[PDB]
């Protein structure tokens, strides 16, 4: 009855969902009291029909962010940066520019002062044009004033971290905290045995999409990932006491918020709302608006610990992906939820949101 009850609450949620957005694959796992539960929808590909499990790679898009944020935690471990370290300290080729002026802080919680959401089309996954971006730019507003979500922000902040542990960021990701975290299914760069498991992304007239090269896409938007090992993951954000002790530390700096927007609390890649609150609030918190446009902070006096009866959550997006993760602190109940198409946030939500009220 127990597996029929939480196949039932599953299906319930998933199944119109992935309908009314035409979604070919999704994949969903639970962890539910140290228990992981896994449900597998549909088609990795429609081509071949391959199905998906809970080991098809999927991109999981800004959900990286959750991984950078990781990697700076570890970084912050090991006294090599601190979050009010000016930006430039980190790298020479910025010092003189406006980044003598913005902290680590500010970059990874995108308050650096109007850094845009993407890199524009002109810049290149190459080291001198990305140098050469972040040498000319020039806030529009004071840094630590306005919330601009922003991949060339927090990427700077993972490249950052990675500069301050002495080794690139892809590197350090592969070769360290991938494995410190038990994640053998979890790649920014899919080793060609493994091609197999890699989902096709479809987006308008079902055209393929896979995630080309771009400027800090690692740090950004570069994972890809199982709902299986995403859920791994999730457990060690549920229970950092069971890692080694410095990649404890680097977990636990993950669940620190700095300010508030509406009801959302900034972390670093995760964001906070209390738990329980509408599905109408936590799907606005993670809308279009929140992604797109700038929006004044409610600075906290001291930062506070994202624990206890809170939701914390990351949507992730590429052209033919759709991620979202959440998971619930105080409840030890966590969820992922994968699909190869890029549908509605509010859609995403109202998955976990379901399955989570269940529960
Ligand atoms: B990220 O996934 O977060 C994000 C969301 C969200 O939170 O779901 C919504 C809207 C935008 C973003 C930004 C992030 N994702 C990307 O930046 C998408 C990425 C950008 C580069 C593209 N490649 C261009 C081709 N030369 C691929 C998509």
Do not use: C
């Not at 957005?21 to 796992?29: R, T």
């Not at 919330?147 to 350090?172: C, D, H, K, M, W």
């Not at 680097?250 to 964001?271: C, F, I, N, P, S």
């Amino acid at each position: 009855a127990p597996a029929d009850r939480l196949k039932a609450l599953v299906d319930a949620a998933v199944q119109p969902v992935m309908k009314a957005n035409d979604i070919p694959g999704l994949a969903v796992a639970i962890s539910l009291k140290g228990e992981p539960h896994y449900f597998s929808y549909g088609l990795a590909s429609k081509e071949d029909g391959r199905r998906v499990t809970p080991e098809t790679l999927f991109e999981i898009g800004s959900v990286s962010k959750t991984f950078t944020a990781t990697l700076a935690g570890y970084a912050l471990a090991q006294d090599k940066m601190r979050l009010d370290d000016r930006a430039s300290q980190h790298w020479p080729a910025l010092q003189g520019s406006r980044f003598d002026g913005i902290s680590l802080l500010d970059l990874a919680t995108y308050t650096a002062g109007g850094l845009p959401l993407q890199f524009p089309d002109s810049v290149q996954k190459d080291q001198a044009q990305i140098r050469d971006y972040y040498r000319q730019w020039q806030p529009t507003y004071a840094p630590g004033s306005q919330r601009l979500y922003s991949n060339p922000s927090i990427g700077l902040f993972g490249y950052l971290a990675a500069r301050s542990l002495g080794q690139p960021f892809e590197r350090l990701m592969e070769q360290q905290v991938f494995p410190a975290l038990g994640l053998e299914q979890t790649h920014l760069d899919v080793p060609e045995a493994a091609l197999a498991q890699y989902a096709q992304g479809y987006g308008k007239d079902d055209r393929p999409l896979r995630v080309g090269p771009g400027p800090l896409d690692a740090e950004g938007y570069g994972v890809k990932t199982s709902a299986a090992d995403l859920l791994r993951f999730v457990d060690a954000n549920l229970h950092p006491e069971r890692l080694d002790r410095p990649w404890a530390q680097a977990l636990d700096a993950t669940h620190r918020g700095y300010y508030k927007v509406g009801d959302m609390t900034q972390g670093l890649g995760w964001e906070a709302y209390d738990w329980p609150i509408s599905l109408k609030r936590l799907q606005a918190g993670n809308s279009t608006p929140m992604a797109l446009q700038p929006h004044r902070i409610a600075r906290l006096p001291a930062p506070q610990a994202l624990e206890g009866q809170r939701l914390l959550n990351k949507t992730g997006s590429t052209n033919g992906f759709g991620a979202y993760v959440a998971f619930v602190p105080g409840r030890d109940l966590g969820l992922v939820i994968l699909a190869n198409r890029n549908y509605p946030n509010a859609e995403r939500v109202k998955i976990a949101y379901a399955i989570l009220s269940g529960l």
